[PDB]
Design a protein around this ligand. Structure first.
Ligand SMILES: Nc1nc2c(ncn2[C@@H]2O[C@H](COP(=O)(O)OP(=O)(O)OP(=O)(O)O)[C@@H](O)[C@H]2O)c(=O)[nH]1
Ligand SMILES: Nc1nc2c(ncn2[C@@H]2O[C@H](COP(=O)(O)OP(=O)(O)O)[C@@H](O)[C@H]2O)c(=O)[nH]1
Ligand SMILES: Nc1nc2c(ncn2[C@@H]2O[C@H](COP(=O)(O)OP(=O)(O)O)[C@@H](O)[C@H]2O)c(=O)[nH]1
Ligand SMILES: [Mg+2]
Lengths: 50, 430, 32, 65, 432, 103, 430
């Protein structure tokens, strides 16, 4: 019966609550950013090439 | 989830709390500046139990400091780890209780305790899930003996179903520095037995004996005793803060240790303890740990454990070992010391395993036990109290602030019948 | 924090686990 | 096992396991820590240091008398 | 934040007060002109003027100007407040009635106004320290009057009196047994704690330990000042076991009428014979209980002990005190009363005592000062009672008192109070 | 003094000596020994800088072997991490230098 | 398995034990730091019999050093092989015994024995399977014979089924160092006969004699004398620590050489012994070994074997040799000396073979034997005792510690009774 939105929250490292969902999004955030390396469409690449 | 708050009062309690935070911060790898500089993820997995964090990611302990004088607070804020504590939590008076239970509970503590009770309400409402309270205080001193027990009463009144911890150092007849110790001790225990769920008893002379005998260091100081007490404290909640083969929280300990509601006075000890010159000769094994655990001199209390029979025993194992070996050791010691264990309850030893040992050690065990041997402490304190009270010595300070001898007589009765019903089970047989 | 550990599928805690076995081995050699 | 590790990762190309006898704290001081056949009652050292290991291992059979 | 006010009255009180303020300046490094060349420990005795000098928190009271004018013309002129030195014109001249009914009435108004001007400046006032020699006119006359006025004006503030009672067999005045008892009636119900500081004991201390065969009053006053510094040392210095002024009467007074106590100090050695002994904690505490080392001419072996508040300043270790105290209890020549099982209130401080340049004392790592309450103090009240009855039986020296406005019958109440006090000591001492 | 740090202390303890010589370890260290106090080796050994000819032998004794040229490179970058004038490098610092390398 | 614990008491006991651990450690290839450095596999198989493993790879003996004066232990620790001993096992008194049996057995050893009894219990329970005890002590000394025999009784009543041996250096009238030797010597043996399972006597006079006629060294000292005893001690349990053709543990020795429960005093001897200059000339063979071991001069005590009748004898052979050549040579002496072996226990020779010879020697034989010749040793001590007892000389020292003349009379009667029953077997015929 663990409940979310329990007033103030810690970081995602702690296991207070809603850490798994937050961790999954953060993990996928760089995997998309990893895909940004797979296909040469990084804005950093554009400015470094610039 | 299941966090607990820490509140301390008096000079002795403040020192105990300061060194406990010392040990806990070192264990969790927190820079005195409040910044996490740890190395493993397990250090941060269960930090919510003892710590909150503010803006910027720095962590702060949820500790509240109370006193009637600013002498100890200014000394503890100027030392190491003195900046973790949130500054508003420093709530204190300006005059002092003057080693008087009446002054610390009726005149000055009563008027000042409103602010500290407000801030503890704030912390309890802020925390996700209050699991219990823990308090450090001394039964001898004025401000501690009064305000600690008054605040226990108020906290229990507002929170009926929570767990109360009191690591209390009782006065001793050998090492005594105050003349009116028995009065305050009796008045404190009278209110303490009524409200507190768990009470930890510690003796100054027992710590001195341990330091002189086991560690064999020539010059003990108050810092070393505080450090030993702090290690014992952390050993209790290690199992809650870290995973293990058999997890055990505070609630499980109370159920498995308390047969009847009024019998909640426990003695604690720590293993291993070795001297510097003999630390490399010893072998860290479970049988050695159990032998040192059941060693009578290892208990941090002056009670003689072999002068009475154990009701229940509990051992919390820190470090990684095998379950079967510890199980068999517990059975073996149970069979070997049947005379020192009560016979109408079977399998009266509780065992738990926590896989994270203390820093710098591969294995460690925290021991807590409930035995009739503690009656000697109350008997020796009662003997002094009645001897001083028969002549009504030093009584008009207590009677000068609304108290009367009737309250003292009632307090004596509540102590005496407690001893009687505690020793009744020693000779009660099935 | 240089979260390199999630690029390849390796757990974050590997960084110091293998550190100590090397550091444990060094201590044993020094002892002998 | 920990995240990212298959249960079969700790195997060689031949499929046989890789055994580090003295790594496990539990089995040290037991027959599996050494190469002796089980029930051998000789004393096995407890602590581990980088000359007793060679003698205690007994990889080859003892010389006949 | 914590402050005390010092009241000096009479020549005996003043001539020991200036010695005390010499010692206090050395401890905090305040120069005699008041400036400090180069944390706020001084706040208990001094108050910052806003820019520079620190002024003492004491008021000097006297009816004769000889001693006060000595201070004003001395090198400590610039330290004290110019209007905190109250002086009169006519001496009391060994007459108690003059200081309590004739001349002391016109001066007490001025002193209370200044004390009021000093208490409002303070915020955490702890109590009062009053110095006066009992066997004198203005010492006993004004001292009784100030105690009466302060007790109603301030009330619950604890007052500590460091009185110097007349010696048993040697004395300066001839009629001092008269006015010693008269002031005894006043201080019994108006001061919290009184300390016995006769001169015979201090003479013996100088002769045996320091080997001073012909000491002057200044040597006596320096030794007294060291005791006062030790008592206050826990207030202004961090220590392992701090003790406050309010934590004296809660631990030293068994019953409200029993608050007379005598002190001791150790070690007291010169700087050349100090090479030959180590001054260990075990032996300095034994020298404290030597009956010859009591600051009052009383033999404690003739009575029980009630309580003992003894303090160590220096680098003593708490474990050492318990080892030393345990030996004392095992000793048989020192016995306590039966209804007080534990009787030691011990404090430890990190501040070793200082020594005045050119002084007799030597600087050491350890010192112990004691305030002890014992039943043996009943003798001194009896011996003055014996002397008073001898003279009053023929009404000698009485016409000087009745003619100054005091009733003839007042001597009856003063005498009957001492007999009542004796009845209390003999009643409490018996076993149960 | 309570602790005798000016007595030059005896090399052999008299098993019944009741005084302190300033070398007593506080209980803070005793309760949590500094990692390797049970092996007789104290960690103020890694900080002593060592030359390459013995560091290499130590590390092949451990089990880490590198071809020449590679070893001089790791030694020189360990020295760079140390940033000390002497060519000798601390063993621990060389260990973190390897930890940075191997990739 | 079947390991034994060692306890050394008194000045002489510590001196004997100082060289014993030196001998064993060199035999097992253990340096004085406890680091194993053996060259053969067999040196590690049975290390646990005498040594305990500790974390860090070092080894520590399970020996307890006990005395009432700390001076002797101060010297042995600083000497070679002094670092092996566990610093915890060092237990000492504070005043010393002064060669007074009553002081070292009744008044001062009584309260000190609590600490020494706790530590020996800890060692005894630690081992998987206890085998027995070995004690080194002096019967002519106060603390050696007083606390020594007191520990014999306390240990025996706690482990009635384990075996237990003692190495006692009885006083010799020729080499006399004390004037009160007859008193405490008589008292100590009174308790020793009732409790000790095995006892082996020693005389310093014989040790001096053996050094002169066999070793012929001009300047002997206590070190050389202790070496002879230490070599004999290691011989008894050598076959226990190493495999042999016919293993014979300590229980093997007890059953064969004890015809009746109270006849447990033996005669010991070690062979071969050779001077430095004649080592090359002599041929080390079994005929030589048997001839030298049976020499009355080779006996380690002042007792004269050819003045009595051998009850039983035992020989432990170390080294590799044909088992037969041991056999018929035992019969060779047995039939050639039929007048020197008891007739009603025919074939009274114990022979055991161990394949590991001592370091530096190819063959060696340790001989322990039970003979009627020990009567003279007990007869002469009783002669001195009763001569000095009739005048009650030096008696006020013992009577001042709660001991009465009834105890003195009983002990001499028992020793007189022991001699009488021990020699009637000499006259016994079938
Ligand atoms: N210890 C000590 N006692 C002193 C000193 N000076 C005076 N006395 C004591 O004071 C007593 C006499 O009173 P005084 O001090 O001389 O005069 P007073 O107290 O000012 O009272 P008046 O007579 O009215 O001036 C003597 O018996 C002394 O014991 C001193 O310097 N040191
Ligand atoms: N363990 C420990 N005990 C202390 C310390 N300081 C004082 N005590 C004990 O506390 C008792 C006095 O309590 P006190 O300080 O007056 O309590 P308070 O008045 O509430 O501050 C003494 O008997 C000491 O044994 C300390 O630093 N550590
Ligand atoms: N073999 C041997 N015997 C010794 C040594 N030291 C003393 N002894 C013997 O012990 C006897 C004295 O015993 P003592 O030390 O007084 O016994 P204690 O008083 O109980 O300690 C003497 O007769 C010596 O022959 C030694 O180093 N080696
Ligand atoms: Mg005057």
């Amino acid at each position: 019966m663990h409940n979310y939105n329990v007033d103030r929250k810690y970081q995602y490292n702690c296991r207070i609550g809603n850490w798994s969902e937050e961790w999954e999004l953060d993990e996928y955030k760089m995997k998309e950013y990893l895909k940004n390396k797979e296909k040469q469409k990084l804005v950093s690449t554009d400015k470094e090439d610039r | 989830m299941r966090e607990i708050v820490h509140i301390q009062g008096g000079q002795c309690g403040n020192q105990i709390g300061a060194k406990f935070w010392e040990v806990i911060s070192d264990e969790h790898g927190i820079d005195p500046t409040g910044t996490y500089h740890g190395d493993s993820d397990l250090q941060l997995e269960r930090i919510n139990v003892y710590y909150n964090e503010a803006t910027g990611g720095r962590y702060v302990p949820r500790a509240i400091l109370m006193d009637l004088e600013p002498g100890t607070m200014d000394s503890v804020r100027a030392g190491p780890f003195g900046q973790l504590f949130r500054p508003d939590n420093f709530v204190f008076g300006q005059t002092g209780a003057g080693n008087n239970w009446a002054k610390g509970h009726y005149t000055e503590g009563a008027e000042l305790i409103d602010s500290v009770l407000d801030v503890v309400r704030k912390e309890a409402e802020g925390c996700d899930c209050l699991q219990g309270f823990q308090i450090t205080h001394s039964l001898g001193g004025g401000t501690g003996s009064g305000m600690g027990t008054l605040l226990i009463s108020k906290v229990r009144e507002e929170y009926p179903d929570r767990i109360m911890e009191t690591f209390s150092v009782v006065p001793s007849p050998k090492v005594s520095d105050t003349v009116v110790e028995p009065y305050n001790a009796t008045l404190s225990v009278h209110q303490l037995v009524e409200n507190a769920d768990e009470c930890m008893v510690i003796d100054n002379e027992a710590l001195y004996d341990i330091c002189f005998r086991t560690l064999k260091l020539t010059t003990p100081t108050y810092g070393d005793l505080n450090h030993l007490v702090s290690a014992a404290m952390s050993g209790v909640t290690c199992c809650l803060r870290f995973p293990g083969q058999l997890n055990s929280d505070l609630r499980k300990l109370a159920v498995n240790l308390i047969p009847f509601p009024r019998l909640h006075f426990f003695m604690i000890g720590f293993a291993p303890l070795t001297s510097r010159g003999s630390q490399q000769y010893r072998a860290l094994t479970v049988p050695e740990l159990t032998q040192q655990m059941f060693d009578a001199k290892n208990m941090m209390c002056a009670a003689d454990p072999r002068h009475g029979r154990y009701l229940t025993a509990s051992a919390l194992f820190r470090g990684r070992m095998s379950t079967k070996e510890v199980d068999e050791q517990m059975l073996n010691v149970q069979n070997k010391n049947s005379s020192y264990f009560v016979e109408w309850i079977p399998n009266n030893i509780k065992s738990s395993i926590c896989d994270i040992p203390p820093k710098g050690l591969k294995m460690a065990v925290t021991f807590v036990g409930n035995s009739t041997a503690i009656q000697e402490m109350f008997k020796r304190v009662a003997e002094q109290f009645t001897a001083m009270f028969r002549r009504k010595a030093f009584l008009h300070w207590y009677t000068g602030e609304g108290m009367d001898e009737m309250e003292f007589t009632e307090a004596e009765s509540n102590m005496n019948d407690l001893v009687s019903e505690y020793q009744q089970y020693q000779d009660a047989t099935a | 924090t240089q979260r390199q550990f999630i690029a390849n599928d390796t757990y974050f805690n590997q960084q110091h686990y293998q550190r100590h076995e090397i550091e444990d081995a060094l201590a044993r050699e020094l002892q002998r | 096992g920990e995240f990212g590790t298959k249960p079969t990762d700790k195997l060689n190309e031949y499929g046989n396991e890789i055994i580090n006898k003295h790594e496990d704290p539990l089995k040290m001081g037991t027959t599996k820590s050494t190469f002796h056949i089980p029930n051998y009652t000789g004393f096995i050292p407890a602590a581990r240091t980088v000359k007793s290991l060679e003698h205690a291992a007994a990889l080859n059979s003892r010389i006949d008398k | 934040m914590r402050e005390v006010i010092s009241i000096h009255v009479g020549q005996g009180g003043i001539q020991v007060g200036n010695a005390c303020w010499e010692l206090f300046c050395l401890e905090h490094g305040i120069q005699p002109d008041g400036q400090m060349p180069s944390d706020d420990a001084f706040n208990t005795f001094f108050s910052e003027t806003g820019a520079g000098k620190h002024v003492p928190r004491a008021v000097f009271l006297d009816l004769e100007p000889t001693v006060i004018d000595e201070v004003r013309t001395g090198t400590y002129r610039q330290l004290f407040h110019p209007e905190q030195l109250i002086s009169g014109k006519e001496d009391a001249a060994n007459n108690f009635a003059r200081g309590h009914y004739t001349i002391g009435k016109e001066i007490v108004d001025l002193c209370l106004d200044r004390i009021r001007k000093l208490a409002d400046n303070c915020t955490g006032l702890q109590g009062f320290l009053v110095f006066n020699s009992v066997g004198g006119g203005t010492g006993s006359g004004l001292g009784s009057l100030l105690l009466e006025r302060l007790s109603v004006d301030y009330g619950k503030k604890s007052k500590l009196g460091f009185t110097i009672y007349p010696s048993p067999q040697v004395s300066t005045a001839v009629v001092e047994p008269y006015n010693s008892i008269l002031s005894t009636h006043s201080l019994l119900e108006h001061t919290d704690v009184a300390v016995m500081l006769d001169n015979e004991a201090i003479y013996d201390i100088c002769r045996r330990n320091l080997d001073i065969e012909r000491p002057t009053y200044t040597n006596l006053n320096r030794l007294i000042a060291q005791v006062i510094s030790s008592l206050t040392a826990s207030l202004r210095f961090d220590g392992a076991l701090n003790v406050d002024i309010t934590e004296f009467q809660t631990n030293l007074v068994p019953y409200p009428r029993i608050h007379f106590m005598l002190s001791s100090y150790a070690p007291i050695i010169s700087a050349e014979k100090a090479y030959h002994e180590q001054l260990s904690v075990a032996e300095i505490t034994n020298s404290a209980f030597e009956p010859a080392n009591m600051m009052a001419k009383c033999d404690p072996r003739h009575g029980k002990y009630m309580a003992c508040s003894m303090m160590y300043r220096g680098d003593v270790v708490p474990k050492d005190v318990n080892a030393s105290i345990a030996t004392i209890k095992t000793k048989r020549t020192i016995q306590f009363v039966d209804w007080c099982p534990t009787g030691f209130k011990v404090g430890i401080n990190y501040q070793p005592p200082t020594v005045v340049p050119g002084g007799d004392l030597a600087k050491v790592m350890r010192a112990v000062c004691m305030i002890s309450n014992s039943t043996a103090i009943a003798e001194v009240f009896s011996r003055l009672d014996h002397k008073f009855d001898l003279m009053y039986a023929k009404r000698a020296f009485v016409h000087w008192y009745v003619g100054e406005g005091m009733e003839e019958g007042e001597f009856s109440e003063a005498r009957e109070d001492l007999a009542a006090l004796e009845k209390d000591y003999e009643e409490v001492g018996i076993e149960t | 003094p309570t602790i005798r740090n000016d007595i030059q202390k005896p090399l052999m303890k008299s098993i019944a000596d009741p005084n302190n010589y300033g070398d007593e370890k506080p209980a803070v260290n005793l309760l949590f020994p500094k990692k390797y106090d049970y092996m007789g080796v104290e960690q103020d050994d890694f900080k002593i800088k060592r030359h390459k000819y013995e560091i290499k032998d130590i590390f092949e004794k451990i089990g880490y072997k590198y071809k020449i040229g590679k070893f001089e490179g790791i030694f020189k970058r360990a020295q760079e991490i140390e940033n000390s004038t002497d060519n000798k490098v601390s063993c621990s610092s060389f260990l973190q230098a390897i930890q940075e390398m191997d990739h």
